[PDB]
Design a protein around this ligand. Structure first.
Ligand SMILES: [Ca+2]
Ligand SMILES: [Ca+2]
Ligand SMILES: [Zn+2]
Length: 332
């Protein structure tokens, strides 16, 4: 069968990559893309983690991540928290046989700037969703700058794993719940409204056809599927998973039950041997199509088992996506 991006107008390369990703679990090898977070644009983003992995393993992560939004920063205009200068490196990563991933630690448009982990009321959340308000204008200012950045990548035909509004079932970011494991049906409904608002801004208003849309709840909180905006708005589902024991991560059955390709959209030690993580994928989470190790203390290069992780027969690394001018063959 053919798995198509939820954006029916998606670029051919993005279409081909999405279908290819969906068929990885039919393989006996090269069926889980490695990944690493490279950092926050114009703050911590660099190629240093990729290079540490090359040095330790002789291989590079298939996926390299950047985050555009430094949402803790106090700035004159809220959109100043967005920087897209990591694009050059992301485009080179694609040209050199990998794939970019972009997340957003968005500043909080309820307020003048910053406050990414300061909670808001449902009333404020409604203002944010209303383009006529001071709040909604701040959100749109941020979305416009993000889209300007994404446009750069679209112009070079670069598919992007785009992972907005993550960990929404957590109680830290402004866009999620306000209280630990406390259901709020209006908040859940408002989240879906915000997700769909961003989807339609990027896809319709800005015509961005190179985005693969990733839904990434936290593995250590309830309501993992309650926030799911639906089959027509999500390409890949996954867990942000920080754990001590790779074999007891919660949520795989629930998310795979949505019949979407599944990924470990973030991974790291909770505080650790990454070789046990790939082993656990084979036994417990076989439909995993990729993992993205976080940076700093969580990274593969600074923990045990980097070589075993990267050299495992299941692990698909930079340079193993393409065979010349076409993707490596699909197993149907
Ligand atoms: Ca376009
Ligand atoms: Ca390999
Ligand atoms: Zn098929």
């Amino acid at each position: 069968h053919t798995v198509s991006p939820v954006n029916p107008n998606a670029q051919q390369t993005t279409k081909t990559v999405m279908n290819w990703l969906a068929h990885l679990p039919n393989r006996t090898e090269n069926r889980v893309l490695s990944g690493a977070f490279g950092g926050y644009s114009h703050d911590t983003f660099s190629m240093a983690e990729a290079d540490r992995i090359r040095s330790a393993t002789g291989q590079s992560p298939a996926i390299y991540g950047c985050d555009y939004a430094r949402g803790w920063l106090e700035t004159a205009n809220i959109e100043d928290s967005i920087d897209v200068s990591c694009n050059g490196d992301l485009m080179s990563y694609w040209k050199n046989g990998g794939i970019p991933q972009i997340s957003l630690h968005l500043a909080n448009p309820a307020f003048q700037s910053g406050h990414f982990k300061t909670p808001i009321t449902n009333d404020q959340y409604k203002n944010i969703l209303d383009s006529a308000t001071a709040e909604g204008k701040r959100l749109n200012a941020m979305l416009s700058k993000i889209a300007d950045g994404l446009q750069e990548l679209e112009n070079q035909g670069v598919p992007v794993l785009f992972r907005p509004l993550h960990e929404m079932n957590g109680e830290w970011f402004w866009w999620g719940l306000t209280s630990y494991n406390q259901k709020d049906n209006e908040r859940i409904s408002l989240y879906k409204q915000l997700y769909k608002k961003i989807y339609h801004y990027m896809t319709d208003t800005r015509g961005l056809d190179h985005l693969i849309w990733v839904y990434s709840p936290d593995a250590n909180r309830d309501f993992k599927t309650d926030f799911y905006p639906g089959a027509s708005y999500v390409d890949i589902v996954g867990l942000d998973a920080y754990f001590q024991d790779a074999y007891s991560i919660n949520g795989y059955d629930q998310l795979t039950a949505l019949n979407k390709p599944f990924a470990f959209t973030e991974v790291g030690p909770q505080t650790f041997d990454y070789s046990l993580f790939i082993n656990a994928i084979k036994q417990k989470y076989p439909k995993t199509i990729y993992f993205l190790a976080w940076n700093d203390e969580w990274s593969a290069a600074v923990n045990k088992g980097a070589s075993a992780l990267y050299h495992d027969s299941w692990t698909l690394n930079k340079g193993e996506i393409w065979n010349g001018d076409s993707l490596t063959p699909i197993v149907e």
